[PDB]
Motif scaffolding. Structure first.
Motif, PDB file in Angstrom:
ATOM      1  N   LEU A 104      52.830  13.296  49.712  1.00  0.00           N
ATOM      2  CA  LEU A 104      53.046  11.845  49.750  1.00  0.00           C
ATOM      3  C   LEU A 104      51.628  11.213  49.372  1.00  0.00           C
ATOM      4  O   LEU A 104      51.234  10.767  48.557  1.00  0.00           O
ATOM      5  CB  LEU A 104      53.305  11.245  51.206  1.00  0.00           C
ATOM      6  N   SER A 105      50.592  11.492  50.248  1.00  0.00           N
ATOM      7  CA  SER A 105      49.252  11.058  50.017  1.00  0.00           C
ATOM      8  C   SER A 105      48.417  12.223  49.167  1.00  0.00           C
ATOM      9  O   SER A 105      48.791  13.190  49.120  1.00  0.00           O
ATOM     10  CB  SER A 105      48.458  10.890  51.639  1.00  0.00           C
ATOM     11  N   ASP A 106      47.263  11.504  48.683  1.00  0.00           N
ATOM     12  CA  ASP A 106      46.381  12.487  47.968  1.00  0.00           C
ATOM     13  C   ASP A 106      45.997  13.901  48.490  1.00  0.00           C
ATOM     14  O   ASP A 106      45.876  14.873  47.709  1.00  0.00           O
ATOM     15  CB  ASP A 106      45.143  11.707  47.475  1.00  0.00           C
ATOM     16  N   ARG A 107      45.509  13.667  49.770  1.00  0.00           N
ATOM     17  CA  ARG A 107      45.127  14.711  50.351  1.00  0.00           C
ATOM     18  C   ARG A 107      46.251  15.514  50.696  1.00  0.00           C
ATOM     19  O   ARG A 107      46.386  17.057  50.349  1.00  0.00           O
ATOM     20  CB  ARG A 107      44.534  14.273  51.910  1.00  0.00           C
ATOM     21  N   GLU A 108      47.456  15.267  50.965  1.00  0.00           N
ATOM     22  CA  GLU A 108      48.892  16.052  51.086  1.00  0.00           C
ATOM     23  C   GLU A 108      49.110  16.526  49.938  1.00  0.00           C
ATOM     24  O   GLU A 108      49.421  17.836  49.820  1.00  0.00           O
ATOM     25  CB  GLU A 108      49.972  15.215  51.594  1.00  0.00           C
ATOM     26  N   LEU A 109      49.027  15.940  48.771  1.00  0.00           N
ATOM     27  CA  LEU A 109      49.185  16.474  47.464  1.00  0.00           C
ATOM     28  C   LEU A 109      48.414  17.737  47.169  1.00  0.00           C
ATOM     29  O   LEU A 109      48.868  18.849  46.973  1.00  0.00           O
ATOM     30  CB  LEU A 109      48.942  15.386  46.251  1.00  0.00           C
ATOM     31  N   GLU A 110      47.052  17.728  47.491  1.00  0.00           N
ATOM     32  CA  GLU A 110      46.056  18.821  47.368  1.00  0.00           C
ATOM     33  C   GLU A 110      46.547  19.976  48.451  1.00  0.00           C
ATOM     34  O   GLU A 110      46.358  21.102  47.812  1.00  0.00           O
ATOM     35  CB  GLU A 110      44.741  18.305  47.637  1.00  0.00           C
ATOM     36  N   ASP A 156      52.346  19.480  36.952  1.00  0.00           N
ATOM     37  CA  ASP A 156      51.413  20.464  36.044  1.00  0.00           C
ATOM     38  C   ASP A 156      50.472  21.462  36.999  1.00  0.00           C
ATOM     39  O   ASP A 156      50.531  22.685  36.107  1.00  0.00           O
ATOM     40  CB  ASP A 156      50.631  19.333  35.207  1.00  0.00           C
ATOM     41  N   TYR A 157      49.937  20.842  37.655  1.00  0.00           N
ATOM     42  CA  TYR A 157      49.122  21.863  38.539  1.00  0.00           C
ATOM     43  C   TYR A 157      50.178  22.754  39.247  1.00  0.00           C
ATOM     44  O   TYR A 157      49.600  24.167  39.234  1.00  0.00           O
ATOM     45  CB  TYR A 157      48.457  21.168  39.487  1.00  0.00           C
ATOM     46  N   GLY A 158      51.416  22.641  39.768  1.00  0.00           N
ATOM     47  CA  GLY A 158      52.152  23.472  40.178  1.00  0.00           C
ATOM     48  C   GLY A 158      52.623  24.293  39.304  1.00  0.00           C
ATOM     49  O   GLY A 158      52.802  25.811  39.644  1.00  0.00           O
ATOM     50  N   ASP A 207      42.599   8.299  40.024  1.00  0.00           N
ATOM     51  CA  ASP A 207      42.471   7.298  38.859  1.00  0.00           C
ATOM     52  C   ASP A 207      43.757   7.236  37.966  1.00  0.00           C
ATOM     53  O   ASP A 207      43.850   6.131  37.429  1.00  0.00           O
ATOM     54  CB  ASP A 207      41.103   8.161  37.931  1.00  0.00           C
ATOM     55  N   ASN A 208      44.673   8.067  38.216  1.00  0.00           N
ATOM     56  CA  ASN A 208      45.938   7.926  37.282  1.00  0.00           C
ATOM     57  C   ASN A 208      46.944   7.992  38.270  1.00  0.00           C
ATOM     58  O   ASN A 208      47.882   8.715  38.382  1.00  0.00           O
ATOM     59  CB  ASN A 208      46.120   9.265  36.432  1.00  0.00           C
ATOM     60  N   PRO A 209      47.060   6.869  39.389  1.00  0.00           N
ATOM     61  CA  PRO A 209      48.053   7.061  40.360  1.00  0.00           C
ATOM     62  C   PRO A 209      49.594   7.119  39.689  1.00  0.00           C
ATOM     63  O   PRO A 209      50.322   7.579  40.484  1.00  0.00           O
ATOM     64  CB  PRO A 209      47.709   5.851  41.066  1.00  0.00           C
ATOM     65  N   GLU A 210      49.488   6.019  39.012  1.00  0.00           N
ATOM     66  CA  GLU A 210      51.002   6.003  38.258  1.00  0.00           C
ATOM     67  C   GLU A 210      51.427   7.395  37.645  1.00  0.00           C
ATOM     68  O   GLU A 210      52.478   7.425  37.295  1.00  0.00           O
ATOM     69  CB  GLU A 210      51.120   5.017  36.958  1.00  0.00           C
ATOM     70  N   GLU A 211      50.829   8.415  37.723  1.00  0.00           N
ATOM     71  CA  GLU A 211      51.068   9.819  36.952  1.00  0.00           C
ATOM     72  C   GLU A 211      50.879  10.818  38.017  1.00  0.00           C
ATOM     73  O   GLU A 211      50.923  11.857  37.448  1.00  0.00           O
ATOM     74  CB  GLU A 211      50.083   9.996  35.778  1.00  0.00           C
ATOM     75  N   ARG A 212      51.012  10.535  39.140  1.00  0.00           N
ATOM     76  CA  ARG A 212      50.334  11.411  40.048  1.00  0.00           C
ATOM     77  C   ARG A 212      51.525  12.562  40.319  1.00  0.00           C
ATOM     78  O   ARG A 212      51.103  13.906  40.471  1.00  0.00           O
ATOM     79  CB  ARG A 212      50.208  10.889  41.576  1.00  0.00           C
ATOM     80  N   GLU A 213      52.584  12.400  40.149  1.00  0.00           N
ATOM     81  CA  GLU A 213      53.964  13.390  40.130  1.00  0.00           C
ATOM     82  C   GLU A 213      53.784  14.148  38.950  1.00  0.00           C
ATOM     83  O   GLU A 213      53.879  15.538  38.977  1.00  0.00           O
ATOM     84  CB  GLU A 213      55.062  12.900  40.523  1.00  0.00           C
TER      85      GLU A 213
END
Length: 157
Positions: A1-7, A58-60, A47-53
Motif C-alpha cells: 500500500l504505502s511506499d515503505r510497504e512496497l519496498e 517490474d522489480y518483482g 516520482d511516478n505515483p500513477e505508475e507504482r504498481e
C-alpha cells in the motif's frame, strides 16, 4: 500500500540484486549498494505515483530473473546477457528498463544521493558515469555503480 510497504514487500529483490551484482563483480558485499538501490526505488515510485504498481511488478519480475541467475551461478555480464536473451524479449526489456531508471535517478538528483552516502556531488556524477559506461559495454548499470562505489571508498585511506 504505502511506499515503505512496497519496498519491504520487495525485500527479495534487493537481496538478489545485491547478491547478483557482487557475484558479477567478484567482491565482498558493500552494504552501501543496497542502501542506494533502495533509495533509488523509493524515488522512482514517489516520482511516478500513477505508475507504482507497474514499477512494483517490474522489480518483482526482476527479482525472479536475478534469483534464477544466482541459482545458475552466473558470474559474467556476458553469461547473464545470454541467459536473459534465452528468457525472451520481455525479460530483456524488464531488466533494461530497471537498469535505465537506476542510472537516471542517480544522474537526476546527485545532491540528494551525495548526502545519503556522505560523498561529493562529483562522486555521485562519477557513479552515474560509471553506470552509463557499463550499460554501454553491455554490463548493466548496477555493476559499474558498485565498482565506482568501491573506488570512491578507496579515498577514505
Amino acid at each position: 500500500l504505502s511506499d515503505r510497504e512496497l519496498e519491504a514487500s520487495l525485500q527479495a529483490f534487493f537481496e538478489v540484486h545485491t547478491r547478483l551484482v557482487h557475484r558479477l563483480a567478484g567482491i565482498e558485499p558493500d552494504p552501501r549498494f543496497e542502501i542506494l538501490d533502495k533509495y533509488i526505488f523509493r524515488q522512482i515510485v514517489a516520482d511516478n505515483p500513477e505508475e507504482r504498481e507497474k514499477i512494483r511488478l517490474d522489480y518483482g519480475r526482476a527479482a525472479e530473473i536475478f534469483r534464477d541467475a544466482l541459482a545458475r551461478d552466473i558470474t559474467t555480464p556476458e553469461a547473464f546477457n545470454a541467459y536473459l536473451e534465452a528468457l525472451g524479449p520481455d525479460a530483456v526489456r524488464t531488466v533494461q528498463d530497471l537498469t535505465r531508471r537506476f542510472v537516471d535517478v542517480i544522474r537526476a538528483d546527485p545532491e540528494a544521493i551525495a548526502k545519503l552516502l556522505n560523498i561529493s556531488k562529483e562522486d555521485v556524477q562519477g557513479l552515474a558515469r560509471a553506470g552509463e559506461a557499463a550499460i554501454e559495454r553491455g554490463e548493466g548499470a548496477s555493476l559499474g555503480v558498485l565498482r565506482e562505489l568501491r573506488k570512491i571508498e578507496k579515498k577514505r585511506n
